[PDB]
Amino acid sequence: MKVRASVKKRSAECIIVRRKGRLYVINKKNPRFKQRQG
Amino acid sequence: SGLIGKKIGMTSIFDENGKNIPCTVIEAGPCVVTQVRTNEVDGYEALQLGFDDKNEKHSTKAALGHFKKAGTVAKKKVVEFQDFAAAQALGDLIDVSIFEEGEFVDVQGVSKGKGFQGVVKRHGFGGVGQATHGQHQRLRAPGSVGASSYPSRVFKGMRMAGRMGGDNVKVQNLRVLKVVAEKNLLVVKGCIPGHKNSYVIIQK
Amino acid sequence: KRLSKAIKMVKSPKTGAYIFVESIMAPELVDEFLKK
Amino acid sequence: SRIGKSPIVIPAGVTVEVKDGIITVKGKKGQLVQEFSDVNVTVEGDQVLVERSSDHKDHRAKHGLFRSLISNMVVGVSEGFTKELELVGVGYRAANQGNKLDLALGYSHNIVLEIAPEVSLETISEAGANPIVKLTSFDKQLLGQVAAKIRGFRKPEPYKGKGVKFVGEVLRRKAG
Amino acid sequence: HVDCGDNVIVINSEKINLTGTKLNDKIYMRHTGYPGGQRTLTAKVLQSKN
Amino acid sequence: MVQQESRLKVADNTGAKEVLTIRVLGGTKRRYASVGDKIVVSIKDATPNGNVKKGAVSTAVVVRTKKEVRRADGSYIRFDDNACVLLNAAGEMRGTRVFGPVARELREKQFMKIVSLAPEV
RNA sequence: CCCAAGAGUUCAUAUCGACGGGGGGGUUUGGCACCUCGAUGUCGGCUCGUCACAUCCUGGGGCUGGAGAAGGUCCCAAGGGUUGGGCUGUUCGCCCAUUAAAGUGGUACGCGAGCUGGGUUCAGAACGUCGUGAGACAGUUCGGUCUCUAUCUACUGCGGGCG
RNA sequence: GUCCAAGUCCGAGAGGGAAAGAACCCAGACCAUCAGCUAAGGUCCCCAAAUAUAUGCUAAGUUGAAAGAACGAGGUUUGUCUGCCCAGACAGCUAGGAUGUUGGCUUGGAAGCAGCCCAUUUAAAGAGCGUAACAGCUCACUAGUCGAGCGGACGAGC
């Protein structure tokens, strides 16, 4: 999981979600596309 | 689950399987229950044990009246234990039998006082420099006690020279070897704080 | 020999759900840790 | 809103009562309780009408949340949910002694679990295939929690595939 | 300059409440005086004892 | 009790007489090395025929110490000179002879090769 | 940190990333000259510590161009620990042997009414070079006095009075 | 910081406010008084005066002193334009997804997917993954289900 200041969908199956007031990019099929910090 | 004893001396025995073992003799005489503090009048469950009886001359009228509600009379060492194993009432006696062979105890005692000791013997500081390479008068000096204008004060807790003395220390699980009950012996393995003929609190 | 981890659930009074309490014990001492 | 404006018609045989904040559902598999706070739920006798008062970004979600919770409790205590785990790998063993599961994985010990009396527990390890454990309960939340804390004992590796997985539920695999 | 007024007896202090998430996000600082001795409590922990 | 900058006598037929201690292996800030402890040494005599050269760096074990060392039974051993035996790159002794007696504490540390060819133990 | 031409067998973001841009910190060299020239003692080392985390080890995880073991990168975390020598006045640096590791910094580049004076800026002498000369050198070498009885506060200990 | 020009203030200036600040805001102190009205700034308590009224926003303790970026986001309120819609809007579920043809050039191999360049049946069919090339999965599209909103662009406030 990488920490970036500007998260964006690195694919078409990624999902942007908000956990505890923090943006995450989750992709269960390709777990190397995980980001946070919004 | 608790007793009072007197440190007799120190010797060395041999285990049943070779090796030598240093040991300390604790004449843990029969203690007597003086007052049982319950959870209704005081606020916690405990009971006092008295160890060594006094005379009718040195004792106070208050102490005489306090121990008259009990069996044996005014004691030299009275200390309050907590969380015993068997529910017992006033006047009962506990000689040595509360300990077994192979158990662990937490002897507590008052160390012997060293008096006013410097930092080298109290905290373990080492010198200021060498002994001859220009050393003038600071062979046993503390050195510096703080920094410059920030914070412009000596921090609380700075290790300096003071009365080393003897406080209460626990020995943390000494192993019991001999629990002879006829003559109160309680031979344990290890050291014990304090000089000879000093009172110690043996917590089981 | 070999130890045995016994995981038993209980109704915690701090919330009301089903928590999990595991502990490494002897293979023949798991019966006394599951009845309590 | 859209999922909350739907009826919760009951498969007759199960009753639902409401209290001062607590809703209870009694069927053929034990009572189930739930606590609602910002929704008005009324049982007419056949359908259960749950509605909201304001649209303030929180009640609009609590409406559907409590509707789905009540529907789940019903389609539970009435019928009940069930799930299946499957142990994949060499030397993996699973045994059942009632409400007590015994798992033998590649660890240096075994794992015995005293599953709560509110969840059934069956096992199938017939000859050589992968041992299949099956749980069944009326509480879907507790069922899923038990299944999760059983699966967490050994996560499915991506290279081979060994691990406590569900039946079906294809895994992400790599080359290695 | 005179101690006028009354004596107040609050009789339900255990039943007081805070508005937002202050019971979980209110901190009390209790520096002791020793280097590195700044202790921080919480509104939830402080009401657990007295 | 042998530490850095300590001169020892090599007791074997490997081809050295006197050696100098460089390090006491077995942890950070380790002070001394009694019998049975491993040390790093540098040869300083290198007998003419020899099998080792003067200036090489090797590893050895302390065999005899002048400091009285205590056992579990309560007894003590105290030799008259600080001696050591060189070791191979692995945990093995180089050579086939050992001069003078050795300590029994060298047996609890699996130095059977060194203890099985000494005059006295 | 932002964009991503590429490099990565193909695949920008496992890993690195040019051409450009936006900020945080005040530990380096600077800019200003604002308090001190009826004196704020300057480098290095010793003793004593204390603080921040921008974490070297131990602790918990995500991804992998992760078969396992060893790795690479990122995230959370300051409780404890973080070696001894050769050379040099050295900070720094190189080397030798270990260790789980041999962290980065601040506190008047911490600390000289705590220590040393090895270096630097005192008076002597000599070398290279400049100057006709007296003399000088961010050139080198040998030698060369470090003052004070603790009042207030700040610390480490021990007592008397009163409540 | 420094050097000029047009003003004000300190210098040589008391008093009130910003918690404490020579210059910032108000305001130019002849004395005395246990009198009143106001400026800046404020009216829950420390500390004089509104726990005053009317309307809306914020959920971050943002904020209640001053002061922040390139670049992200399905936080929320609000104005205009704007397409799809009971002849059935978006999502979900089920099924179909062809033929000339494996289009032509090149390539040992290019068959919709190394690179370049229409027709027929229909409710509809287009000359991403992967395979040495095929194959196969998926997508564009259409058919049935429930039946009411589904979205974009330009702004403005927090």
Within 10 angstroms of residue B143's Cβ, the number of other Cβ atoms is 10
Q: Report the sign of the C-alpha dihedral through residues A27, A28, A33, A38, in that order.
A: positive
Q: After which residue numbers is chain C interrupted with C–N beyond 2.5 angstroms?
A: none
Chain B residue with Cα closest to E33: B156
Q: Do F73 and B12 touch (CB under 8 A)?
A: no
Q: Which amino acid is at B119?
A: V
Neighbours, chain C (3 or more CB pairs < 8 A): D
Q: Does F89 touch chain B (CB under 8 A)?
A: no
Question: Which residues have a Cβ under 8 Å from the Cβ of A12 and sit 6 or more positions away?
Answer: none
The whole-angstrom separation of Cα D103 and Cα D88 is 12
- Separation between the CA of D147 and the C1’ of G73 (whole angstroms): 34
Q: Do D114 and C3 touch (CB under 8 A)?
A: no
Nearest alpha carbon to residue B79 among B31, B137, B144, B39 = B31
How far does CA B111 lie from the centroid of its chain?
7
Chain D residue with Cα closest to A29: D172
Q: Do D111 and C5 touch (CB under 8 A)?
A: yes
DSSP state of F54: T
- Separation between the CA of D2 and the C1’ of H85 (whole angstroms): 18
DSSP state of D140: H
Per-residue HEC secondary structure of chain B comes to CCEEEEEEEEEEEECCCCCEEEEEEECCCCEEEEEEECCCCCCCCEEEEECCECCCCCCCHHHHHHHHCCCCCCECCEEEECCCCCCCCCCCEECCCCCCCCCEECCEEECCCCCEECHHHHCCCCCCCCCCCCCCCCCCCCCCCCCCCCCCCCCCCCCCCEECCCCEEECCCEEEEECCCCCCCCEEECCCCCCCCCEEEECC
State both tokens at F15.
């081809």
Cβ of A23 < 7 Å from strand H? yes
Give yes or no for a contact between D87 and D129, defined as CB atoms under 8 angstroms apart: no
- Separation between the CA of D39 and the C1’ of H157 (whole angstroms): 32
State both tokens at A31.
């777990």
Mutation pick from D113, D139, D143, D150 vs chain C, by most beta carbons of C within 10 Å, is D113
Using alpha carbons only, how large is chain C's radius of gyration in Å?
11
- Separation between the CA of F83 and the C1’ of H78 (whole angstroms): 94
- Interface present between B and A (3 or more CB pairs within 8 Å): no
Nearest alpha carbon to residue B154 among E34, E39, E31, E37 = E34
Q: Does A18 touch chain D (CB under 8 A)?
A: no
Nearest alpha carbon to residue B3 among B107, B139, B112, B157 = B107
Residue with tokens 């060819």: F117
- Separation between the CA of B131 and the C1’ of G124 (whole angstroms): 33
Residues in chain C with CB shorter than 8 Å from the CB of D95 are none
Q: What are the backbone angles phi and psi of residue F95, rounded to the nearest 5°?
A: 120, 180
Give yes or no for a contact between D29 and D119, defined as CB atoms under 8 angstroms apart: no
- Interface present between B and F (3 or more CB pairs within 8 Å): yes
Q: Does F73 touch chain B (CB under 8 A)?
A: yes
- Chain D closest-CA separation from residue C28 CA (Å): 12
Q: Judge residue D168's burial from the number of C-beta atoms within 10 Å of its C-beta, 0-12 exposed, 13-18 middle, 19 or more buried.
A: exposed
Residue with tokens 């390090």: F23
- Cα separations (Å) of D32 from B202, D6, D27, D48, D72? 56, 21, 9, 16, 11
Q: Judge residue F119's burial from the number of C-beta atoms within 10 Å of its C-beta, 0-12 exposed, 13-18 middle, 19 or more buried.
A: exposed
Mapped onto helix, strand or coil, the DSSP state of residue D23 is strand
- Cα separations (Å) of D41 from B41, D37, D68? 53, 10, 13
Q: What is the DSSP string of D54-90?
A: --SSSHHHHHHHHHHHHHHHHHHHTT-EEEEEEEEST
Give yes or no for a contact between D157 and D163, defined as CB atoms under 8 angstroms apart: yes
Give yes or no for a contact between B12 and B21, defined as CB atoms under 8 angstroms apart: yes
Q: Are strands F7-10 and F83-87 parallel, antiparallel or unpaired?
A: parallel
Report the number of secondary-structure helices (H) and strands (E) in chain A.
Answer: 0, 4
In angstroms, what is the resolution? 2.8
Nearest alpha carbon to residue B81 among B195, B204, B164, B194 = B204
Chain E residue with Cα closest to B153: E35
Q: Indicate which technique resolved this structure.
A: cryo-EM
- Measuring from the CA of residue A23 to each C1', which nucleotide is nearest? H73
Residues in chain B with CB shorter than 8 Å from the CB of E34 are 155-157
